[PDB]
C-alpha cells in the first residue's frame, strides 16, 4: 500500500471533454471537489466515442505505484469499466502499468502496481461500466507513490506573519521581508508597509509596521547600496523612496522620484548611484524614462534615457510592457538591459545619459517575468518568462549572454518545464538555480506551479532537476541565496480573500552541501577575512584547509522576479606562507565589482562552499 502523491502543479488534459452542456473539463479531476467532473465530450451531438483518455502531467518524475479513481456521486453515467494505465518519463514513449475492469458501483477504485518512474500517467477508459452510453467521467484522480529523494533537501516550512513578496538579505544571517499595507493584500497608497525579519540562526521572526516613511513599498524597485543600506523606491506610494539600515533595523525617508512608478527595476551602479527605468504599474501609464539617484543630489532625470527601447509587445500595453527590466551594472559603469523585451540595450548614466541598441536576445521571444542571473564576470543566464504578463504560455527556453567583449547571445538547453514568475539564484559554485513559477502565467494562481527547481551548470549547459519543494511559488514569490549557501524560497499570492496566499517560506539545501545519503557534508571554513575592502586591492584570507577558489557573491534584494543585485565574481587565490593563507586580487572595475555587501565563500576542490563571511566592498 502506498499513500497519495501531492498534486501541486499537476496539469490534466484529455482526448475530449464536455464544456457546452456542463463543465466537464479535465482539470476538474485535480481540484479535490467530489462534485466537479471530467466528462467526455457529448455535445453538440454527435458524442465523442469510447475510448477516452485522461493524461496527468505531474511536472516531476515521481515513483508511481497506484491510481485512485473517484466516480461522480450524482448518477451512474460515465463510470469507467475497462481501463488501462500507462506511464511515461519523456511524454513520448509509454509503458503499460495496469489493465482491468472496474465494477459498476460508486466506490472509489484503487489500482496498485510495482512502483514505476513517471512524469506522466494516462488513464484510458475503454468501456462504460454499465454499457449505458459512450461516456467516461471522473470526479477525482489521485496517484499513489513517493516523491523523488534528492538531489538536495528542503526544510520544513517557515511561518511568516505576512506573504513575503519582497526580500533582502542582511549581514549576520537575517532576512528582511515585506508585503504591503496588509499582511495578505495590497491596494491604495496608504504609506504603511508590513515587514518581517527572519533570524536564520534561531528561526525567530520580528514583525514591524513601517509607517515613518509614508511609503507602502509593495511593487517597488529595490537595490543594495555601497554602505549596506537597502534603497526601495516606488510601488503603491509611487513617488516615494525609503532606505533600510540593517544596523538599527530602521527605515529612513529618502527623496521623491521625479516620476512615480511601480514594477520598475532599480540597479546600483559602479558609482553607488541607483538607476531606475520603466514601471507603469503605479504613478501613471507610460513615459517612465530613466532617472538616477545619488545620496547628495537625490533623484535626477536622464533626458537621453527614454523608456521606449525596453518596451515589450505585451498585449496589456503600457501598463505591463515597461515592467521588470533585466538590468545589470556593466564593466566601465554602463547599465546593460538584457530583456525581457527581445531588444537589448546599452545604457549610459553619465550626464544626460544615452541608450544604444545591443541587438536582440538571439531569437528569444519577449520573456516578461523571466529571470536573468549574472553567474560570472560579464556572463548572464536568462530563462523562462512569457510574451505576456497575463494569460500567457511560458517558455522553457534559456539563453546565455556574454557582455565581456561586445554582446554574444546563444540559446542554451531548455529547462525541463516552462516557467513564468520563477526566481533565479546564482550559487557560489557558478551554477544557477531556477525555482518556482508556473506553466501558464496568470497572476494570483497556483495552477501549473513548477514544484522541482532546476540547476544549470555552465560547464555542461545542462539543467538538472532538484528534489521538489512542498509549497507552490508563483506570482509574488521570492528566492535568494543565503550566507550558508542555502536558498530561501517564500511567498506567493497576496490576494486577500483568495485561497492562494502563502505566509511562509522553505529553505533549500542544494546538492553541493549534502553527502550522498542526504546528511550534511563536511565543509571548508574561513578562519579570517577582512570585514571591508576596496575594489582593486589585494586581500589575505585564512581558511581551515588549503583553498584556491573563492567566490564573491553580492548580497540580494528581490521582488516580482527582479534581482539586479546578485552577481558572482570567482577569484583564484595565490597561496602564501601561513596556515592556509592566500591572497585574492579584487577587480578594480566597479562596474563588475559593484560596491556593496558581499558574501565571500571558500570553495573546496570538491565544490563544497564554506559558510560565507560578509565583506563590505567600496
Amino acid at each position: 500500500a502506498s499513500g497519495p502523491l501531492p498534486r501541486d502543479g499537476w496539469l490534466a488534459s484529455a482526448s475530449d471533454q464536455e464544456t457546452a452542456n456542463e463543465n466537464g473539463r479535465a482539470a476538474n479531476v485535480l481540484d479535490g471537489d467530489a462534485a466537479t467532473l471530467w466528462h467526455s465530450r457529448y455535445s453538440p451531438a454527435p458524442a465523442a466515442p469510447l475510448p477516452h483518455t485522461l493524461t496527468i502531467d505531474m511536472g516531476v518524475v515521481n515513483q508511481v505505484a497506484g491510481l485512485r479513481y473517484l466516480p461522480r456521486f450524482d448518477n451512474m453515467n460515465g463510470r469507467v469499466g475497462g481501463y488501462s494505465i500507462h506511464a511515461s518519463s519523456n511524454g513520448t514513449s509509454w509503458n503499460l502499468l495496469a489493465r482491468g475492469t472496474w465494477a459498476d458501483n460508486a466506490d472509489e477504485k484503487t489500482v496498485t502496481f510495482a512502483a514505476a518512474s513517471a512524469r506522466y500517467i494516462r488513464l484510458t477508459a475503454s468501456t462504460e461500466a454499465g454499457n449505458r452510453g459512450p461516456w467516461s467521467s471522473a470526479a477525482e484522480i489521485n496517484l499513489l507513490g513517493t516523491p523523488p529523494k534528492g538531489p538536495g533537501t528542503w526544510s520544513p516550512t517557515v511561518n511568516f506573519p505576512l506573504v513575503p513578496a519582497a526580500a533582502a538579505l542582511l549581514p549576520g544571517n537575517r532576512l528582511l521581508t515585506w508585503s504591503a499595507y496588509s499582511p495578505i493584500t495590497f491596494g491604495g497608497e496608504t504609506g504603511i508597509t508590513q515587514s518581517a525579519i527572519l533570524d536564520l540562526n534561531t528561526g525567530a521572526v520580528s514583525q514591524a509596521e513601517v509607517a515613518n516613511t509614508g511609503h507602502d513599498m509593495f511593487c517597488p524597485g529595490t537595490s543594495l547600496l555601497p554602505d549596506g543600506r537597502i534603497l526601495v523606491s516606488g510601488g503603491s506610494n509611487s513617488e516615494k523612496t525609503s532606505l533600510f539600515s540593517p544596523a538599527t533595523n530602521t527605515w529612513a525617508p529618502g527623496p521623491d522620484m521625479n516620476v512615480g512608478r511601480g514594477y520598475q527595476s532599480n540597479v546600483t551602479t559602479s558609482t553607488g548611484e541607483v538607476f531606475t527605468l520603466g514601471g507603469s504599474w503605479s504613478g501613471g501609464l507610460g513615459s517612465k524614462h530613466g532617472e538616477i539617484w545619488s545620496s547628495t543630489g537625490g533623484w535626477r532625470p536622464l533626458p537621453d534615457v527614454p523608456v521606449d527601447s525596453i518596451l515589450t509587445d505585451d498585449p496589456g500595453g503600457e501598463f505591463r510592457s515597461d515592467n521588470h527590466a533585466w538590468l545589470f551594472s556593466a564593466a566601465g559603469g554602463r547599465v546593460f538591459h538584457a530583456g525581457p523585451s527581445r531588444e537589448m540595450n546599452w545604457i549610459s548614466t553619465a550626464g544626460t545619459g544615452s541608450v544604444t541598441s545591443a541587438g536582440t536576445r538571439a531569437d528569444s521571444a519577449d520573456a516578461m517575468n523571466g529571470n536573468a542571473v549574472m553567474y560570472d564576470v560579464g556572463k548572464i543566464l536568462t530563462m523562462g518568462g512569457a510574451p505576456g504578463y497575463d494569460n500567457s504560455d511560458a517558455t522553457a527556453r534559456a539563453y546565455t549572454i556574454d557582455i565581456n567583449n561586445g554582446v554574444d547571445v546563444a540559446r542554451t538547453s531548455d529547462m525541463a518545464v516552462s516557467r513564468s514568475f520563477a526566481n533565479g539564484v546564482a550559487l557560489p559554485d557558478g551554477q544557477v538555480l531556477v525555482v518556482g513559477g508556473q506553466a501558464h502565467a496568470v497572476p494570483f494562481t497556483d495552477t501549473g506551479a513548477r514544484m522541482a527547481p532546476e540547476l544549470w551548470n555552465p560547464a555542461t549547459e545542462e539543467w538538472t532537476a532538484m528534489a521538489p519543494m512542498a509549497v507552490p511559488r508563483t506570482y509574488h514569490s521570492v528566492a535568494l541565496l543565503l550566507a550558508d549557501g542555502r536558498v530561501f524560497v517564500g511567498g506567493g499570492g497576496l490576494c486577500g480573500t483568495c485561497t492562494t496566499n502563502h505566509l511562509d517560506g522553505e529553505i533549500f539545501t542544494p546538492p553541493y552541501l549534502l553527502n550522498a545519503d542526504g546528511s550534511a557534508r563536511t565543509r571548508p571554513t574561513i578562519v579570517d577575512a577582512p570585514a571591508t575592502a576596496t575594489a582593486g586591492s589585494k586581500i589575505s584570507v585564512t581558511t581551515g584547509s588549503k583553498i584556491s577558489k573563492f567566490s564573491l557573491m553580492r548580497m540580494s534584494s528581490v521582488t516580482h522576479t527582479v534581482n539586479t543585485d546578485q552577481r558572482r565574481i570567482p577569484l583564484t587565490a595565490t597561496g602564501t606562507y601561513g596556515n592556509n593563507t592566500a591572497t585574492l586580487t579584487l577587480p578594480a572595475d566597479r562596474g563588475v565589482l559593484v560596491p556593496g555587501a558581499y558574501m565571500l565563500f571558500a570553495m573546496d576542490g570538491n565544490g563544497v562552499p564554506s559558510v560565507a563571511t560578509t565583506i563590505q566592498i567600496s
Partner: peptide, 7 residues
C-alpha cells in the same frame, strides 16, 4: 476530498 455540492 471536499464537495461544493450540486446546483
Amino acid at each position: 476530498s471536499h464537495s461544493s455540492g450540486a446546483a
